[PDB]
């Protein structure tokens with residue numbers, strides 16, 4: 234079926250939970266043996282969210298190459314994304330090592346450091362120009378260059394230096410700051426505006442490594458971001474845009490990382506975002 238009318242048909246029939254459970258039943262299951270080794274327990278935020286072995290990002294290190302991060306490679310859309318968990322106190326150095334080694338231009342953050350009164354990720358970037366951060370375990374230095382605070386999101390320019398070679402790179406940090414503590418946004422308008430700002434920066438483009446996107450577990454809000462982007466890109470590429478099937482795209486993405494889209498409300502919100510976004514494109 235088309236999307237907008239399949240949408241109204243699920244709303245009127247109140248069957249979002251049954252659609253979402255079908256997706257969960259049909260999703261791929263692949264091994265995640267490296268994630269579960271005992272030496273990696275303090276590298277995982279949640280015991281039930283792990284990268285598959287076949288698609289995990291490897292750190293360029295001989296001691297321990299593990300990070301909770303996955304490469305989602307979308308062949309028809311010609312987009313790639315790295316989805317990862319919010320960094321932990323003992324993985325902030327690994328996070329920036331990955332950014333460096335994978336040649337990423339942008340980092341997309343979809344959570345706040347504290348939500349619901351609890352810490353959802355580490356404070357992994359500097360808050361003042363004159364107070365830079367040094368990650369000694371991976372030999373990197375990180376400096377805040379500028380910061381632009383808007384009503385729904387903040388953009389930061391950062392300098393990342395590889396202290397071993399003295400090479401430097403400019404990283405863009407795109408921080409969506411207004412996702413509600415419970416549920417999903419009432420309108421997709423600010424999320425779409427945020428997506429378009431990431432696109433306009435060049436961070437999603439083939440002349441760079443894959444964008445790094447994260448929330449707390451790296452599967453819910455993060456999944457919503459890449460699912461919406463990819464579906465809109467396919468609607469631009471194809472002769473028949475109504476042939477884009479959002480459930481089939483989601484199941485393709487779940488071949489690369491488990492659990493993408495965590496609730497039926499997130500699924501509905503993803504439909505809403507693609508539907509509204511397809512009107513603005515034209």
Ligand SMILES: COCC(=O)N[C@H](C)c1ccccc1
Nearest residue numbers: 379380381388389390405434
């Ligand atoms: C006032 O800055 C507007 C603005 O978008 N700033 C952001 C932080 C930016 C983007 C690209 C390069 C440098 C800085």
